[PDB]
């Protein structure tokens, strides 16, 4: 019982990534409606990946988590 | 000006013109941006068949 080695922040996973190994079975060519939510999901997800700095150089905070809710 | 006077389904047309002008100036960045605006505005139900075709 002593700290004798370390383990990287990659290893000792809960489960590996599914976004660069596997790929989901859905795209927005097989989404139909919810066009109203389609404008909202690219604000939250798609724009911070390509450049998170967009929010910062505007001076608006980037949203935190996304709740999806409904029946 | 017609955002102070917004009640208009006639700005849907103005967006589509705006897209065509930008396209022929050969910028697709803001041709896409206006075209996106025009799609959103026609999602609300008042639009002619002609308007949807354009």
């Amino acid at each position: 019982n002593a700290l004798v080695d370390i383990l990287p922040p990659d290893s000792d996973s809960s489960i590996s990534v599914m976004g660069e190994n596997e790929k989901p079975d859905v795209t927005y060519a097989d989404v139909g409606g919810l066009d109203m939510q389609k404008q909202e999901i690219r604000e939250a997800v798609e724009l911070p990946l390509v450049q998170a700095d967009l929010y910062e150089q505007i001076g608006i905070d980037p949203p935190r988590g996304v709740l999806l809710y409904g029946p | 000006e017609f955002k102070k006077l917004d009640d208009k389904p006639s700005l849907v047309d103005v967006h589509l013109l705006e897209s065509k002008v930008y396209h022929k100036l050969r910028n697709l960045a803001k041709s896409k941006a206006s075209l996106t605006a025009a799609r959103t505005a026609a999602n609300s139900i008042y639009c002619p068949t002609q308007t949807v075709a354009e």
Binding site: A29, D30, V31, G32, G33, L34, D35, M36, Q37, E40, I41, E43, A44, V45, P48, L49, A52, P62, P63, R64, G65, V66, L67, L68, Y69, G70, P71 | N43, S44, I45
Partner: protein, 71 residues
Amino acid sequence: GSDREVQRILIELLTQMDGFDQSTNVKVIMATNRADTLDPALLRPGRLDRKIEFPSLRDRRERRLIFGTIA
């Protein structure tokens, strides 16, 4: 005590949700099927900022889309 393990796990979500923030990454996406299971320290902003609603009513062009993509 076993129901207190559940609560302890929720507390770690808050800790890691706070720690994650202002980083390039997309702040956690989570979805619910009942919006009566939330708490006022989970739904509170800094954990969940954005609220994308999901209706069942939509409108006639967006219900039209659902008939057509599965068609």
